[PDB]
């Protein structure tokens with residue numbers, strides 16, 4: 001297949017007590033899998049459309065592709081953006097640390113803005129720290145669903161899933177507690193790597 | 202400031218009779234300029250939100266940034282994606298040509314899918330040929346407005362503005378004639394350059 | 403103020419085993435309450451904008467109003483659309499029954515279309531049976547979030563909340579089981595009343 | 604057919620010099636017609652879906668229905684909301700006038716809010732004065748495209764088409780001039796009638 005479901009870089013319960021293993025299992029094995037299957041299906045139907053010269057469902061297929069592929073991209077980044085507490089730095093350092101200071105003033109300012117963007121979403125969405133190639137800077141974006149409210153070319157550095165399935169079983173309606181806990185498992189090494197590769201294509 | 206209005210790489214009337222100089226002037230001098238100002242303003246507002254430590258308008262600011270920055274990105278690519286009729290090959294060649302045949306079967310198949318995506322938009326939008334870094338392939342996407350219906354990380358290679366201001370004064374409601382005429386001014390050399398740089402990340 | 407949180411017309415656990423009392427409490431006391439407060443706040447903000455004669459945040463305020471008021475409307479109908487198992491007929495009768503057969507062919511056909519609309523949503527949303535005043539017919543609509551994908555003037559007759567918070571704690575990712583169980587608690591008497599009042603405008 | 608294209612209640616050039624007859628002709632004969640045809644088609648495909656028990660394209664069909672029907676509803680109201688200058692009151696009076704004063708403070712405040720909502724739209728959209736049945740009041744809403752950003756049950760009283768095709772040929776990018784001119788042709792008698800019938804189902 002074109003798209004494949006990546007394995008978690010750690011055990012399902014490795015992020016506890018911050019993120020329950022029950023959520024990690026359903027989230028990865030069920031939800032992420034659906035997006036991979038959906039993205040592959042969209043490509044197959046588009047191929048069939050070209051073959052038969054029948055583009056009647058083009059609007060449906062283009063949304064299916066965007067929604068599912070965006071879901072696949074977002075979650076693939078999401079898994080790697082996390083690591084068990086103690087297995088990675090508690091704060092960004094070196095180049096990444098300096099860059100965050102440059103575009104946000106301080107790490108605390110970045111956290112406050114990222115958190116506000118995460119908890120204020122009206123509907124399903126993502127809080128995202130991205131590299132803007134046309135501006136050469138790091139900005140925060142608030143995705144709607146998976147594929148809305150973002151410029152083309154945006155390179156994801158750090159992302160937080162704010163869809164209810166990502167926190168409801170453990171935190172219920174208190175999304176704030178979820179975000180506070182989540183900061184404890186952010187793998188700053190992964191973010192730093194993405195940054196190094198992002199600012200150069 | 203952070204974002205600037207790029208100048209056109211050709212005269213305003215260089216794309217005639219395909220696209221009128223009148224549209225080119227309004228589109229570039231009025232419309233594109235507004236997105237640059239809007240994107241800069243969004244960043245300024247976000248900075249002020251950080252200083253005052255008040256993110257009450259975070260939802261508005263993130264949408265202002267996404268909408269305006271996406272408008273800026275989309276039009277910047279759009280201008281370079283075109284060139285006077287005989288200034289570039291009417292058909293893709295070399296690496297780009299082979300890539301199109303690989304992912305679409307043929308150039309004609311690609312044109313058919315791109316055209317269908319462009320003319321079927323329900324509202325304002327864009328037809329886009331992008332490089333998918335995850336699947337390592339070229340896909341067509343149908344953007345809604347400027348910032349919706351696309352996966353993060355999508356690298357724009359070729360884009361067509363389907364907002365009414367882009368064709369109404371010349372083609373009125375007949376979107377089909379606009380798209381047909383547009384193919385004549387596509388700068389495949391620019392698209393090839395974007396493909397080369399995107400493929401190496 | 404202008405909007406108030408309506409009380410449930412039954413006990414929190416009256417819809418068990420179909421919908422857990424735990425979900426009913428969180429859904430009504432926490433989620434619905436937030437939309438009431440948000441809708442009232444949006445109106446207050448708009449009034450202040452009028453006094454100060456500054457509409458700089460008009461885009462944010464109009465979305466806050468639409469999102470929150472739609473959330474309030476949708477849930478208000480939702481609560482009344484349900485009732486304890488044997489408190490109402492398991493199948494529509496009289497005028498409503500005839501109307502369903504007229505616009506859908508049969509009750510089963512209506513259920514099939516409504517269910518497909520409910521389970522196929524890409525993101526948060528609602529499956530809705532509405533009265534179309536213009537066409538004078540009953541149609542099914544698929545709302546995105548609370549306020550998108552619907553014509554103005556649509557009168558809600560029967561609605562099903564497909565946001566993850568509505569079923570996740572009990573049914574997890576299996577949307578299908580949630581919808582199947584929900585049909586057992588539909589209050590057709592409430593739906594019939596809404597139809598009668600909507601048809602006479 | 605279920606939906607039909609209503610005729611204009613006046614000549615195509617009756618609204619000049621405020622709105623050109625050239626725009627009125629394309630807008631009504633071409634654009635509005637497309638929405639009626641689209642709405643009818645959506646219903647036919649939904650009927651076919653139920654017959655064959657094939658709801659694979661349900662997401663596409665529900666959006667096609669919402670987009671086209673909303674477009675039909677919005678324009679049907681739009682045509683009647685206008686009348687040649689001098690043929691109707693320059694201001695709202697009696698019940699409507701008092702209601703506007705009640706929910707906006709004054710006619711001037713309502714105009715300022717409505718205008719701000721009209722010119723600030725990010726993408727295609729509508730500025731709308733609606734009757735809120737769950738609140739018993741008149742509010743202003745900002746529709747995105749035709750079917751987004753509005754609560755179910757909203758009854759349109761006065762609407763302004765802010766899609767570029769509605770003003771571009773005459774006003775180009777200056778949407779402000781279009782809105783200023785438009786106020787001269789508002790048929791307050793039509794709005795008053797809709798209000799009388801709206802506040803009572």
Ligand SMILES: [Fe+3]
Nearest residue numbers: 031161163166
């Ligand atoms: Fe998720």
Ligand SMILES: [Fe+3]
Nearest residue numbers: 232362364367
């Ligand atoms: Fe444009």
Ligand SMILES: [Fe+3]
Nearest residue numbers: 433563565568
């Ligand atoms: Fe809900």
Ligand SMILES: [Fe+3]
Nearest residue numbers: 634764766769
């Ligand atoms: Fe229109």
